[PDB]
Amino acid sequence: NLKLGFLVKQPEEPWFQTEWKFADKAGKDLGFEVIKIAVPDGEKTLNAIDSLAASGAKGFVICTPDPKLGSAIVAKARGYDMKVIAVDDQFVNAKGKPMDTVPLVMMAATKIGERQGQELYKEMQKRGWDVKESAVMAITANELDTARRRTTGSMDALKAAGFPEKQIYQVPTKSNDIPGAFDAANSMLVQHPEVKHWLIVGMNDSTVLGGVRATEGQGFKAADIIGIGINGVDAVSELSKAQATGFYGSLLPSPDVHGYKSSEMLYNWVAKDVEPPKFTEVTDVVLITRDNFKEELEKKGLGGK
Length: 305
Ligand SMILES: OC[C@H]1O[C@H](O)[C@H](O)[C@@H](O)[C@H]1O
Description:
Blueprint: E1 3-8, H1 14-30, E2 33-38, H2 42-55, E3 59-63, H3 70-79, E4 83-87, E5 104-107, H4 109-127, E6 134-140, H5 145-160, E7 168-172, H6 178-189, E8 197-201, H7 205-217, E9 225-230, H8 236-239, E10 247-252, H9 255-272, E11 279-282, E12 286-289, H10 293-299
Parallel strand pairs: 1-2, 1-3, 3-4, 4-5, 5-11, 6-7, 6-8, 8-9, 9-10
Antiparallel strand pairs: 10-12
Helix pairs in contact: 1-9, 2-3, 4-5, 6-7
PDB class: binding protein
Keywords: binding protein
Assembly: monomeric
């Protein structure tokens, strides 16, 4: 019967593959089929929408590849009598202000970013690094609000625990992926020869991993590096390696909730004109490291590791 879209900007990340698996579980429970389309750039996004109107879909969940496409995605969907829910990244108007009217499902970004900052400082104390030869590398993507609130929340926590403000160095990355973050961290590294230990701050696992691979290339051994990712499911290949590395752990939020919950809310609204709440913030988070990753994921239902 009913066909609903689930469009994601980055199908390569296990984060979005998980949302897709859980949207499928909601289609089997509620009686709808989920059409799964990758939308890595804005042209594919707008095309994908035409494509869903041709398959007869009545609505879609989307994680847009650029928040500034919001108006266009809304104009096209209104065009085809399709309801829209945004997952993870909020639509913004042309001036950059949030479009408050499309229902949104996202993580509590500031709170998880603060947890990241508090865990970096606890591991730094466990290792006993001297703060005078340590520094924070913060890889930022400030044009995306969800990314910006996670890195600022993390820098803010670090400064609140007492890490010196002037030894916090920010560098923007051009893409939210390993090659982008690598290039960014590499450029920051050669500018600071005085630093003997680094904390790496990034909004997600791929961003922290690019950071860590750059440090390795510049001769830091793992004891001198601490990076902690966000997404959990994306760091399982790192945490499964024989050897420990500078990537110490990752904060596991709930992509299963993002996937099923937005897909069930879209269906209630398409099928019973039941209006979704405008804003749903998911606060779940657990620290996974090489010691508990397998247990914690099996415990959240994401079995295998
Ligand atoms: O909501 C969490 C989600 O936030 C953004 O969309 C990131 O690019 C993803 O990798 C994921 O971390």
